Design an enzyme around this catalytic site. Structure first.
Site, PDB file in Angstrom:
ATOM      1  N   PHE A  36       0.866  -1.179   0.000  1.00 33.50           N
ATOM      2  CA  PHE A  36       0.000   0.000   0.000  1.00 33.50           C
ATOM      3  C   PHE A  36       0.905   1.233   0.000  1.00 33.50           C
ATOM      4  O   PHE A  36       1.489   1.552   1.040  1.00 33.50           O
ATOM      5  CB  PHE A  36      -0.925  -0.023   1.235  1.00 33.50           C
ATOM      6  CG  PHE A  36      -1.917   1.132   1.309  1.00 33.50           C
ATOM      7  CD1 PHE A  36      -2.513   1.657   0.161  1.00 33.50           C
ATOM      8  CD2 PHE A  36      -2.274   1.667   2.545  1.00 33.50           C
ATOM      9  CE1 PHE A  36      -3.449   2.702   0.244  1.00 33.50           C
ATOM     10  CE2 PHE A  36      -3.205   2.706   2.645  1.00 33.50           C
ATOM     11  CZ  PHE A  36      -3.794   3.224   1.489  1.00 33.50           C
TER      12      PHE A  36
ATOM     13  N   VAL B  30       0.731   4.267   0.355  1.00 35.01           N
ATOM     14  CA  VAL B  30       0.522   5.285   1.386  1.00 35.01           C
ATOM     15  C   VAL B  30       1.248   4.963   2.701  1.00 35.01           C
ATOM     16  O   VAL B  30       1.651   5.876   3.439  1.00 35.01           O
ATOM     17  CB  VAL B  30      -0.989   5.481   1.653  1.00 35.01           C
ATOM     18  CG1 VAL B  30      -1.250   6.289   2.936  1.00 35.01           C
ATOM     19  CG2 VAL B  30      -1.654   6.155   0.445  1.00 35.01           C
ATOM     20  N   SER B  31       1.410   3.669   2.978  1.00 32.34           N
ATOM     21  CA  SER B  31       1.923   3.217   4.258  1.00 32.34           C
ATOM     22  C   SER B  31       3.433   3.302   4.328  1.00 32.34           C
ATOM     23  O   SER B  31       4.128   2.749   3.480  1.00 32.34           O
ATOM     24  CB  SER B  31       1.455   1.784   4.537  1.00 32.34           C
ATOM     25  OG  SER B  31       2.333   1.140   5.417  1.00 32.34           O
ATOM     26  N   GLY B  32       3.935   3.995   5.351  1.00 38.20           N
ATOM     27  CA  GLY B  32       5.377   4.043   5.610  1.00 38.20           C
ATOM     28  C   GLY B  32       6.052   2.671   5.662  1.00 38.20           C
ATOM     29  O   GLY B  32       7.026   2.428   4.938  1.00 38.20           O
TER      30      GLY B  32
ATOM     31  N   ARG C 180       6.174   1.059   2.386  1.00 40.69           N
ATOM     32  CA  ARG C 180       7.194   1.715   1.573  1.00 40.69           C
ATOM     33  C   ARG C 180       8.614   1.308   1.974  1.00 40.69           C
ATOM     34  O   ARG C 180       9.484   1.178   1.117  1.00 40.69           O
ATOM     35  CB  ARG C 180       7.017   3.240   1.582  1.00 40.69           C
ATOM     36  CG  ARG C 180       5.998   3.734   0.535  1.00 40.69           C
ATOM     37  CD  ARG C 180       5.867   5.262   0.531  1.00 40.69           C
ATOM     38  NE  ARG C 180       4.984   5.759   1.596  1.00 40.69           N
ATOM     39  CZ  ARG C 180       5.414   6.325   2.726  1.00 40.69           C
ATOM     40  NH1 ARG C 180       6.714   6.495   2.934  1.00 40.69           N
ATOM     41  NH2 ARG C 180       4.545   6.735   3.645  1.00 40.69           N
TER      42      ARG C 180
END
Lengths: 215, 215
Positions: free
Chosen positions: A8, A10-12, A15
């Site tokens: 995802f 958006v997720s740190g 990432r």
């Protein structure tokens, strides 16, 4: 048979897992999992893991979650050298240490601020939470006084994880003028493989947080 | 030359590091560091680390903090076999995964409840915080549905860390009747080397929290 990451952007932590894959240079299938839209979630994802955990790695049916476990597993399994996760036990301990710092202090305190703003109706950054995060930033700023990167004078998977975390709060808007070593390091992080890809997801995270803050 | 742990028996993470040392069976010097009384803090501790981090390991001048980094370092450096932290990359990834679960979800949510009660004038357990912890307990309860211990059918350093965390909240008083697998596992944890020593520190932690809760 192909190596797969359920991701995802958006997720740190999601990432951070992808950044590690980029750093060690492994070809990986990326299945985008939109956690914002659960009714749209695909069967291929809902099937393999106890609950909706992102990131999730599927390495030939070995299913692994937890971004930093993924990073260490990828580095040891597919790394073409030692640089990214050194085999020396003391050098490895320092990288593990920074990873646990990311997981137990840094991202925890970013999340304490951002999660209630995104999902729980919070409209401001609480002073107590700001101070708490800033105390953790100060520690990070000290790590980076000794060495160029977080865990050594060369980049490691500790940098990919901590970069994923830091890019998240920086995209929300955080004043790090008090931390010149983080300022230096965050420009060096732009040189990391897959940094733009990280920056784009961080910006989406940042925008969604800002959107709910009443200025 | 002797291996040394700077330890605060009240602290879950400090107890998790010592439990790992007990499990792998290494003789260790234990310097008690009373974090409740900072003006009484000894020079030998204040000297070696950036700030007052507990637990801190001093292995012949290699100074390491972060309880789970310590556990992994001790297991690889001094372990007499593989059991406690398997070298197989996939088995190791699962232990790392549970360790990051301890650091990012479990102890984080225990701390969210207990820290403000101990230090910040909080007198009750917030419903939101209780639910948050219970969601993490439910996940742990599922880990323990598959295997006898958290990460395998034999105990690992993931059990010593998660036991240190769980014993902390259980000593405060937590209803885990909804989690029969945790109930089973926590009795098995009493068989771990150094379990009483852990239980005594957990009880001190528990008492200090209760003392501030208005019933």
């Amino acid at each position: 048979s192909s190596l797969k990451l359920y991701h995802f952007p958006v997720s740190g932590p999601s990432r951070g897992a992808l950044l590690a894959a980029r750093a060690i240079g492994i070809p990986i299938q990326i299945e985008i999992v939109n956690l914002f839209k659960k009714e749209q979630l695909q069967e291929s994802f809902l099937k393999l893991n106890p609950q909706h955990c992102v990131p999730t790695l599927d390495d030939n049916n070995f299913v692994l979650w937890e971004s930093r476990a993924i990073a260490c597993y990828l580095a040891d399994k597919y790394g073409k050298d030692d640089q990214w996760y050194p085999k020396d036990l003391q050098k490895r301990a320092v990288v593990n240490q920074r990873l646990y710092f990311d997981s137990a202090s840094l991202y925890v305190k970013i999340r304490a601020i951002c999660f209630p703003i995104l999902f729980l109706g919070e409209t401001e950054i609480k002073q107590s939470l700001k101070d708490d995060l800033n105390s953790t930033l100060s520690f990070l700023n000290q790590f980076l006084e000794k060495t160029k990167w977080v865990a050594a004078d060369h980049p490691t998977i500790a940098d990919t994880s901590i970069y994923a975390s830091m890019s998240s709060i920086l995209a929300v808007g955080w004043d790090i003028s008090s931390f010149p070593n983080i300022q230096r390091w965050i420009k060096d992080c732009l040189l990391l493989p897959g940094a733009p890809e990280n920056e784009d997801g961080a910006r989406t995270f940042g925008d969604a947080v800002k959107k709910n803050i009443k200025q």
